[PDB]
Ligand binder design. Structure first.
Ligand SMILES: [Cl-]
Ligand SMILES: [Cl-]
Lengths: 117, 117
């Protein structure tokens, strides 16, 4: 099992940071639960999360500041409304809900830099 | 009218580059045609393009190497299959097809750096 994400992402002047979160192993029938966590001193804060049961579908509908899409082995994440205080480490967590066997994995985190707009 | 896009995007190690393309003014009923152009010496090459008629929908369905979603005032773009040689300046073009009046705008380009380790 393995989840990976980019090391660094430079947010847009308007505070948008988009990047992929990839995982293995993957299958044609994958359905996943994706969770974005910000890591600080010893602890993590959940930023947003969503479930994807099919491709070509926009997720995180109930989170104004997160959006994303999904296809086998990859979740395209978008984090919005970022401010200077928000630069830091953001972990991507992926849970394979179907097909069995079940498994959970987490990336090493993407350093998001919100550079002086 | 105005279209803006990030200045720099560091492509993922798997050749994935995602970034927003924002326009103004916007409207709840907006329907747009989005075009991605790669700019080289004096000329431009059309990479991919798609039409969005409703929010929360995934576009560029007919392009294996492009994807994206749309919401009022913002198109979230994703270009994949990128190689080191594809490093370059990518312009985002937006045509507001509805509601009237018709308008077309283009950003100053996003410089996408690709290093496929
Ligand atoms: Cl990278
Ligand atoms: Cl990216």
């Amino acid at each position: 099992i393995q989840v990976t994400q980019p090391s660094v992402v430079l947010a847009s002047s308007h505070g948008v940071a988009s990047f992929p979160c990839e995982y293995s192993p993957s299958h044609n029938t994958d359905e996943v639960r994706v969770t974005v966590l910000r890591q600080t001193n010893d602890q993590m804060t959940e930023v947003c999360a969503t479930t994807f049961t099919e491709k070509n579908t926009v997720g995180f509908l109930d989170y104004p500041f997160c959006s994303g899409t999904f296809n086998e082995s990859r979740v395209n994440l978008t984090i919005q409304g970022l401010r200077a205080v928000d630069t830091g480490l953001y972990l991507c967590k992926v849970e394979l809900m179907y097909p069995p066997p079940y498994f959970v994995g987490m990336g090493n985190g993407t350093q998001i830099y919100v550079i002086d707009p």
